[PDB]
Write a protein that binds this ligand. Structure first.
Ligand code: WH4
Length: 284
């Protein structure tokens, strides 16, 4: 039996290495990673890889790894796939912990935009979780944390993190992580997967996929939202992505909204994340 080496970037930035038989399906590698992480609530998570166009793709657990990575390295990242709308209802603290690590990267990366005060507040809960109670011994008037809190750091942000950290004395790691999540879950881009597209007129838009449904970001003024129950059919053909929008009470016909994606693979990728979100969030 021939085995391929797999490298997985974990959410703390460390690398997990293992071997799987070369015809293994994605579920095999994912089960190895989740066992390493002591993770039981695995349904919210997945592995991504980069394709030959350098696009992030979800590794499909049902399909052979080799038929997905194709010509690329067997290099993966461990990620949140389905962001829980109510992290308080997850059964395990360790689930909440990995969700916090993902969100910290969503924030530092700029995928999850955040006000100054919310960057500082989230930062303060991370520090409380990671270091425990505030200690002035480690932190003088010139303190800069090793923790990344934002896409751009300022001394004012570091100071506000410390001020709010002082307020969390006695807070345990699980408690700080729950506070982090109660705040992060409210952010307008929480758990929103953005795809670049053009509308039927050629105007550049972003399509957001999340728990609540499909979002169309046009220009600051005019954001369309289609709740999953309002979506009967998701389709792709060539470079085009289509959603079937329910008639609404006393209308005779379903209505159709069409988008142009950069290429056929981008349209298929958007279709698959929409179908997976619709299934997941129709059962939640
Ligand atoms: C399917 C996910 C992992 N990758 C992605 C998300 C948004 C836009 N393009 C690619």
């Amino acid at each position: 039996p021939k085995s391929m080496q797999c490298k997985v970037i974990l959410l703390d930035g460390s690398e997990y290495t293992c071997d799987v038989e070369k015809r293994s399906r994605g579920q095999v590698l994912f089960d190895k990673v989740c066992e390493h992480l002591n993770l039981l609530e695995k349904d919210y998570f997945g592995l991504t890889y980069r394709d030959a166009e350098n696009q992030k793709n979800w590794l499909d657990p049902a399909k052979e790894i080799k038929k997905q990575v194709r010509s690329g390295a067997w290099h993966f990242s461990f990620n949140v796939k389905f962001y829980p709308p109510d992290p308080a209802q997850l059964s395990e603290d360790i689930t909440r912990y990995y969700l916090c690590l993902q969100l910290r990267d969503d924030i530092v990366s700029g995928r999850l935009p955040c006000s100054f005060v919310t960057l500082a507040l989230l930062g303060s809960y991370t520090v409380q979780s990671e270091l425990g109670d505030y200690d002035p011994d480690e932190c003088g008037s010139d303190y800069i944390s090793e923790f990344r809190f934002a896409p751009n750091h300022t001394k004012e942000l570091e100071d506000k993190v410390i001020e709010l950290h002082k307020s969390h004395r006695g807070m345990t790691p699980a408690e700080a992580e729950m506070h982090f999540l109660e705040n992060a879950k409210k952010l307008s881009m929480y758990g929103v997967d953005l795809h670049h597209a053009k509308d039927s007129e050629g105007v550049e838009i972003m399509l957001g996929v999340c728990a609540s449904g499909l979002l169309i970001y046009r220009d600051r003024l005019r954001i369309n939202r289609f709740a999953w129950p309002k979506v009967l059919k998701i389709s792709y053909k060539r470079n085009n992505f289509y959603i079937k929008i329910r008639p609404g009470e006393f209308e005779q016909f379903e209505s159709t909204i069409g988008f142009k994606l950069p290429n056929h693979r981008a349209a298929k990728r958007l279709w698959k994340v929409c179908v997976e979100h619709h299934t997941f969030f129709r059962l939640l």
